[PDB]
Subunit: 268 residues, 4 copies
Amino acid sequence: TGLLDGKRILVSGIITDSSIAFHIARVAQEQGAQLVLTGFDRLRLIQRITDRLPAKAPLLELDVQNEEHLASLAGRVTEAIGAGNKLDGVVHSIGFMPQTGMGINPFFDAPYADVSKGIHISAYSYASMAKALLPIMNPGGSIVGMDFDPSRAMPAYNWMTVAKSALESVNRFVAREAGKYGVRSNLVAAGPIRTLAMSAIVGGALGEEAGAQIQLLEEGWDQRAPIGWNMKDATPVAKTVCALLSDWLPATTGDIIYADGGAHTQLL
Amino acid sequence: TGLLDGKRILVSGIITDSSIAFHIARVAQEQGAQLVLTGFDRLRLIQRITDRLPAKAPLLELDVQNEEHLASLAGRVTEAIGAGNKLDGVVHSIGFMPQTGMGINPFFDAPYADVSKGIHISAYSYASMAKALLPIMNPGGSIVGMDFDPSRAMPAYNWMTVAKSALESVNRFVAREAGKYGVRSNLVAAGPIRTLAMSAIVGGALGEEAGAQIQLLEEGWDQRAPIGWNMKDATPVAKTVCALLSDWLPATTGDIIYADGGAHTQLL
Amino acid sequence: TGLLDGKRILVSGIITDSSIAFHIARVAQEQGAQLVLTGFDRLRLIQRITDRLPAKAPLLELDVQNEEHLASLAGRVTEAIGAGNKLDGVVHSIGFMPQTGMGINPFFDAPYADVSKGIHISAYSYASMAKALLPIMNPGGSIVGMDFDPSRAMPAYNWMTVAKSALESVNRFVAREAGKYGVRSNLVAAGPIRTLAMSAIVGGALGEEAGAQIQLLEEGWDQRAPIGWNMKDATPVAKTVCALLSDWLPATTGDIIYADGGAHTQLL
Amino acid sequence: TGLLDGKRILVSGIITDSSIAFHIARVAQEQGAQLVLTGFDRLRLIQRITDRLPAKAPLLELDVQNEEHLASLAGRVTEAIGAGNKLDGVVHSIGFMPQTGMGINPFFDAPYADVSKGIHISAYSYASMAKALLPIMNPGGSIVGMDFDPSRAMPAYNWMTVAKSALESVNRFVAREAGKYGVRSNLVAAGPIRTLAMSAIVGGALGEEAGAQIQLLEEGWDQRAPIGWNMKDATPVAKTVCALLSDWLPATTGDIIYADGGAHTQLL
Ligand SMILES: NC(=O)c1ccc[n+]([C@@H]2O[C@H](COP(=O)([O-])OP(=O)(O)OC[C@H]3O[C@@H](n4cnc5c(N)ncnc54)[C@H](O)[C@@H]3O)[C@@H](O)[C@H]2O)c1
Ligand SMILES: NC(=O)c1ccc[n+]([C@@H]2O[C@H](COP(=O)([O-])OP(=O)(O)OC[C@H]3O[C@@H](n4cnc5c(N)ncnc54)[C@H](O)[C@@H]3O)[C@@H](O)[C@H]2O)c1
Ligand SMILES: NC(=O)c1ccc[n+]([C@@H]2O[C@H](COP(=O)([O-])OP(=O)(O)OC[C@H]3O[C@@H](n4cnc5c(N)ncnc54)[C@H](O)[C@@H]3O)[C@@H](O)[C@H]2O)c1
Ligand SMILES: NC(=O)c1ccc[n+]([C@@H]2O[C@H](COP(=O)([O-])OP(=O)(O)OC[C@H]3O[C@@H](n4cnc5c(N)ncnc54)[C@H](O)[C@@H]3O)[C@@H](O)[C@H]2O)c1
Ligand SMILES: Cc1cc(C)nc(SCC(=O)/N=c2/[nH]cc(Cc3cccc(C(F)(F)F)c3)s2)n1
Ligand SMILES: Cc1cc(C)nc(SCC(=O)/N=c2/[nH]cc(Cc3cccc(C(F)(F)F)c3)s2)n1
Ligand SMILES: Cc1cc(C)nc(SCC(=O)/N=c2/[nH]cc(Cc3cccc(C(F)(F)F)c3)s2)n1
Ligand SMILES: Cc1cc(C)nc(SCC(=O)/N=c2/[nH]cc(Cc3cccc(C(F)(F)F)c3)s2)n1
Ligand SMILES: [Mg+2]
Ligand SMILES: [Mg+2]
Ligand SMILES: [Mg+2]
Ligand SMILES: [Mg+2]
């Protein structure tokens, strides 16, 4: 009697045990979902990481920049879940921007080739994944992507913020197409989560000023959030994604749900 | 094993079996919640209407314009649910604007006394209810109010739209206060629902032009919604309110969840 | 050859030489406009203050809570500017909220009578003034009101923020009506300006915590503004109002122009 | 005694006499500005078109996808305007999306190579142009780009809407950098203008359904605009750009000014 009992849900984006997607997968399994996982490049690592999930799930390779992987994906998923079965949910938890597009590297000095790669992986791939999987999704189904509110500019995040603005726009178009299948498409805009990469950045991996700026941003988030914000805890974010995967938000699509402690609603 | 098993939830705003609050109450009871109901003025009618709910619930009188009713409310609720018990949820489903403030009556011709009454009931009362009930709410609790997206002006709705803009602002402040109790505050912005009053209005009760305009607005909503919009079905709205009353959106506050078919995300 | 050469413009809201309206009036006169001024209650004071403007202008009494003043206003203006002449612009620079609705007085402790008075003066009066003056405005004309961005909640400002949310909604409806006369309606959302009252508040007139909070807010504004923000200088705000009064934004109505240093576009 | 007397302004994006940039250039010259023009690929055509402007202006080649053109641009401009002189304004009026990214070609069927080209030209180039020209701009200067409101999805516009969402984000970051030079950066979001390409599209060049949809969108715009919207008249848009190029919006940056008849403020 979990929130997601009987649902078949694909979860992308696990790379470490600090991945937001790891916690989405854990909570969904706790709530009765049957998962198919996708992973990029380091499949041995990902298998070993996902061995710590509450239940065993098949792992498929998916590089979203690889047209063959995308073209074969629906077939591979159907093989994993069995002929005649379809997916009820899809989680996009994929993002990347080359180091030239973040941190103390000046905003104007990011070459377009690097920005384009970041936008490919972080924004266009949400459309790619919906194209590939909508044909094997059930009516009432749900596609959910991860967002970081890009409505105002911020230090350090630079072109990744631009990629998120593009992702929000992409989501509104995906909703039009997904609606033809009876499927919802939405984003969860999370507050900052202290993943391995975010910890490295705060430690100065992309420069001291950038680290200092991101640290101030994290502190400001908890102070603005009327219920507080714990950047070391992905569970509230994972729960929100599961809410959208469930049957309990059936009239919400093309939209953005903020799992940020309410920080975006307060100026200070 | 309902979504709201064991929760104690107060539900305001039932007047007929077409009330959005009637459906919120029905769905919450289906999901295991224990309700306390509040009603305005016609308590005999409300008792008879609420006899059709899945479970019996106590009904308390609450006129939100009555300072004594508000001052006694927490005590009366505690009497109904038992000393030592607190509420886990509160639903504000209260709205009103005098006829001078809606329809074909020109926008400029609404006297301020009428507008002020509408704003009192529709916006300020969300703060009044939170003031009264926060002292008897548990941490992890949830306050939810009903909204109709007022970001753009519309024909006929006139000062009621202004009242909703004020309610959205009020909600952001209520969240600051509610956060001190570990409690969330949010609004559900619904698409149009064909209540008795909305049917009367479309039938011309506030003028022919106003009726025609609201009818065009309803038609436009279903056409813009990527998953469609059924104005005769309050269930998707009721489910969304229950989602916010549950433990599954624990990092969302001061915010607005759109149960509108995704219509607000599309231009056509 | 000023920006506003030949235009006849009514300017409300002067009370001291720190009033934003004083600077709007000064800049408009510098740019060739012919003014009619309106003042509330302290007409001797206002006359003496406005004697420091670059040119003499008639001063009319207008209490926006007084229905007789509003009913006679168009006639009195026509008397001042001459039969057969109409206004090309109208400036609403009027705001008030009783002390119970701002500062350290708890948000929940403002009586509705006080909030209603604040909303009457700060929001409803924008509609009242447009109703009174549209019949004596020329096509191509412009109505401009003063706003403080209320999209997110803030400390201390409390019910005044709610009143601004209502004013933004009112402006969108006023634009519908004003469009029938060929007239635009817009708001300028200014950053904080150190008027006499704002200085008193920062000095603690509405409590120490409230003062401290507003001071932090002012400091944050200059730090977020990509071009900086000088709270002691109303001239950039006055220039923006004049821009909207001119012929150079002829396709903008129901809208909000931000004269805030760009602060609202940045998170830090 | 024009609005822009004495200002030196670079204007990109003229290709035909229906180009929005043609009208921006004409109005700026009418208001006393000294122009430098940039053109892409068809320089003979552009020279002949710009011969119809009120005053002669030098024309420089600029393909924004060409790193050499961008690297030499400041030098070439300085040659055109004279050593020791700087620019006071810069107009970005550049946009493109391959046909696979617009019209009846399904949203999911646009190859990323095509989308990336569109985003390069339509969004990233706003940053490229600011990088190139900020070093030769005066304090008090102004950078302005053209936008089409992408907050909600629309039929047919597809990936061009995504590119505009990215441009809005890019503008907020450009404002941070431009502020260091005392320079403002803003976008004008215009309603639909019947350029040669828009006429071709409505005539079905990208499919019948797409044409029909864009035609309905244009009609809806005029009906929602409280002051109306004339898609055959670029002058109100050109005036708005000139407003931002002038000294009269000195506290607005990272922002978007809507020259759309107020259509975005109304639902119907
Ligand atoms: N960490 C934060 O503060 C935060 C805040 C809000 C949103 N998000 C978003 O949540 C999502 C998950 O990121 P995370 O913070 O958990 O970091 P992460 O590094 O754990 O997850 C990012 C994932 O993207 C995958 N990826 C990269 N390139 C790929 C490709 N070509 N094909 C397929 N997958 C690829 C990586 O393998 C990795 O699994 C991202 O969209 C991120 O922007 C993160
Ligand atoms: N019907 C719609 O299309 C629609 C769309 C979005 C949101 N809403 C909102 O949903 C909420 C419920 O409205 P509804 O459409 O179900 O209509 P309804 O008439 O069924 O409910 C309105 C309720 O407000 C109560 N009320 C009025 N004055 C009161 C007072 N002084 N004290 C206490 N209660 C009082 C009424 O008794 C009634 O129960 C309202 O906030 C409304 O604005 C309605
Ligand atoms: N000072 C700020 O930081 C700031 C920031 C953004 C916007 N604003 C707004 O600018 C406008 C002007 O305010 P200000 O800061 O210059 O303060 P102010 O006190 O100088 O101006 C407020 C004016 O409102 C007038 N007023 C009050 N009650 C009235 C009534 N019943 N009838 C007619 N007029 C009445 C007062 O007489 C006074 O002239 C207000 O709308 C205010 O909210 C102020
Ligand atoms: N026409 C509309 O309805 C409308 C509405 C809002 C905004 N806009 C925007 O206004 C701007 C001007 O477009 P327009 O409608 O006047 O069409 P247009 O075709 O007249 O102008 C587009 C210009 O972009 C230039 N361009 C394309 N690729 C280039 C490159 N690689 N390098 C340099 N320049 C290049 C073209 O040469 C052309 O001059 C665009 O940003 C457009 O998106 C148009
Ligand atoms: C909002 C947000 C924030 C973050 C940190 N990641 C994400 S998506 C995951 C992502 O982009 N991961 C990256 N890993 C590495 C990137 C670039 C980089 C280059 C060199 C060094 C680092 C370092 F040290 F790991 F931070 C990072 S970007 N989204
Ligand atoms: C967004 C929205 C829309 C509606 C119709 N009601 C609500 S809240 C409920 C509400 O305001 N109820 C009203 N009942 C009566 C009102 C004014 C009125 C006056 C005369 C006649 C009518 C009529 F006929 F019932 F429509 C209505 S307003 N909110
Ligand atoms: C955004 C914003 C901010 C401010 C300060 N005023 C405005 S409109 C002008 C306004 O409301 N003036 C007021 N004057 C007095 C008010 C309440 C008050 C009560 C007691 C003492 C004060 C004090 F000391 F002058 F600040 C103020 S509110 N708008
Ligand atoms: C918002 C908006 C709307 C439009 C029509 N253009 C712009 S920027 C100018 C632009 O993108 N021009 C284009 N010219 C051609 C494009 C693709 C296309 C391909 C084949 C045929 C056409 C046709 F027929 F000229 F419309 C167009 S896209 N921005
Ligand atoms: Mg294990
Ligand atoms: Mg019964
Ligand atoms: Mg004098
Ligand atoms: Mg010639």
